[PDB]
Amino acid sequence: TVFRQENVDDYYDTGEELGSGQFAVVKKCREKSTGLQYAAKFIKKRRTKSSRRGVSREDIEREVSILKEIQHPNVITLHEVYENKTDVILILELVAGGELFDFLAEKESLTEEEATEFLKQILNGVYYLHSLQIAHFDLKPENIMLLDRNVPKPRIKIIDFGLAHKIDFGNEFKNIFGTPEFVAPEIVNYEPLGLEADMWSIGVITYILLSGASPFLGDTKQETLANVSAVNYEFEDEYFSNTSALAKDFIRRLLVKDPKKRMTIQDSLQHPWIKPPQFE
């Protein structure tokens, strides 16, 4: 699929740079015709088929296709797509409250109420995605943005669908791999992947929200990955002594090696606690 090839600068003015990645940079922008604000994500294209630099056309189109399907309050929305010789530019909904990663870095740790307030939104967004057979595959605090961080109960949106895939045949088997600290054992072992991988990531996020510590983090990527594959984690008393048994139960049912025995997104919403790259 081809995208708009007019110069994006003729329709938008850019400003503050929100984030910078390995193959993408995001900048705040304003549409000239409406004055409405957005986030422009510039994704670097590959210059040759055998090039390691840039993102393949296939991978860019997958992200765009998935974003176009989604429409939910807890998921970033896509407005337009432009492209030129060097980049594909996604004009996305602007979320300027910062990363949940940054929010957590300031509060150190959250109360169960604060954690569940965030989790309920993440679960609702993932429920929507999984209902459409969409696996995100890169869930972590950095990919959860707040709309406004200056309110007692910040609302969020899931972002960065760069690894997202449609799981129409139950699983995907193509070496999909995210950040070591958050990937499920099946990812570490290069096995078929499904929606279950996202649930494991949610368990890791929940552990972090409640303790300010990462469950499988080692001193090197290989150590972290080895820890993940062996499900080498513990609810350290220093961090969890005053955490409810139900919260631990919730995490324990997500950090399960066998994907088939792991809680599904529907299970997570009915759980009593809720129910109202890889190489160094």
From Swiss-Prot:
Residues 12-274 form the Protein kinase domain. The active site is at D138. Coiled coil: none annotated. Isoform 2 is expressed in normal intestinal tissue as well as in colorectal carcinomas. It comes from the Eukaryota. Induction: Up-regulated following treatment with IFNG/IFN-gamma. ATP binds at residues 18-26, 41, 93-95, 99, 160. Changing K41A: Loss of activity, apoptotic function and of autophosphorylation. Ubiquitinated by the BCR(KLHL20) E3 ubiquitin ligase complex, leading to its degradation by the proteasome. Removal of the C-terminal tail of isoform 2 (corresponding to amino acids 296-337 of isoform 2) by proteolytic cleavage stimulates maximally its membrane-blebbing function. Interacts with KLHL20. Interacts (via death domain) with MAPK1 and MAPK3. Interacts with MAP1B (via N-terminus). Interacts with PRKD1 in an oxidative stress-regulated manner. Interacts with PIN1, PDCD6, BECN1, TSC2 and STX1A. Interacts (via kinase domain) with DAPK3 (via kinase domain). Interacts with GRINB. Interacts (via death domain) with UNC5B (via death domain). Interacts with UNC5C (via death domain). Calcium/calmodulin-dependent serine/threonine kinase involved in multiple cellular signaling pathways that trigger cell survival, apoptosis, and autophagy. Regulates both type I apoptotic and type II autophagic cell deaths signal, depending on the cellular setting. The former is caspase-dependent, while the latter is caspase-independent and is characterized by the accumulation of autophagic vesicles. Phosphorylates PIN1 resulting in inhibition of its catalytic activity, nuclear localization, and cellular function. Phosphorylates TPM1, enhancing stress fiber formation in endothelial cells. Isoform 2 cannot induce apoptosis but can induce membrane blebbing. The autoinhibitory domain sterically blocks the substrate peptide-binding site by making both hydrophobic and electrostatic contacts with the kinase core. Belongs to the protein kinase superfamily. CAMK Ser/Thr protein kinase family. DAP kinase subfamily. This is Death-associated protein kinase 1. The chain holds residues 2 to 277 of 1430 of the full protein.
